[PDB]
Amino acid sequence: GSWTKEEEEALLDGLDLVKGPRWSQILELYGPGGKKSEVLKYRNQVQLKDKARNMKLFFLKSGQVVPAALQCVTGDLRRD
């Protein structure tokens, strides 16, 4: 359920590397058999997308800087 700090860092690094909200490519890097590591092996594409939106919402709602990697996550950030 809840994410570790390492998982959150991997999602942000993945977004930076795949140059956009390309969730399957993040799992090529960090998912099961990931090229970099398996730190996101238990998060599916639906989970990556929702977490990226929730992290962007967290920075916005707390008045903190949105990292460049999350600026490509656009549109509605509300939970389904």
9, 18 Cβ separation under 8 angstroms: no
Give residue limits of the domains in the chain.
5-70
Burial 33-68 (b: 16+ CB within 10 A, else e): ebeeeebbeebeeeebbebbbebbbeeeeeeeeeee
Residue type, 2: S
What is the 8-class DSSP label of residue 20?
A: S
What are the DSSP E strand ranges found in 1-80?
none
Angle of helix 5-18 versus helix 23-30 axis, rounded to 10 = 120
| Structure letter (DSSP) for residue 30 | H
Q: Is the dihedral of CA 26, 31, 32, 36 positive or negative?
A: positive
